[PDB]
Amino acid sequence: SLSEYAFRMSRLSARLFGEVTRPTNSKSMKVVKLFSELPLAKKKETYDWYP
């Protein structure tokens, strides 16, 4: 639903701002989320829950 100009201007902003550049579905975008944060088990509240 974007013009060629808008589609290529959005793809250029993604390159500059370090976003995903290839067309990626929502399912595959979970890979980005998984590596953008620490896993729950690696959070200090989790492994240092108990004294």
Partner: protein, 101 residues
Amino acid sequence: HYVDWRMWRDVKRRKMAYEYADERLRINSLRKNTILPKILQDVADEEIAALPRDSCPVRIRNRCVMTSRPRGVKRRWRLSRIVFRHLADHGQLSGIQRATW
């Protein structure tokens, strides 16, 4: 010296879940996309299913750190409702008071 055997099992689950977190994260990444071949994702399914059961983070339970009560726990202080109230009602929890409005 933990409160009970159930707290001791969760301590071990938290220790093993921490040790396998990176390995599980990497294998899961292979399963959580539509980019890689199914033949490769089917193998990753078997690999993460073969890891020790207590490496799975959903088996960790937030128990009261002083009484091991498995429910009625306030996450911010990691205490059961009973233990929290005991400290709060004696003025030992900074800034916490009874609420009237």
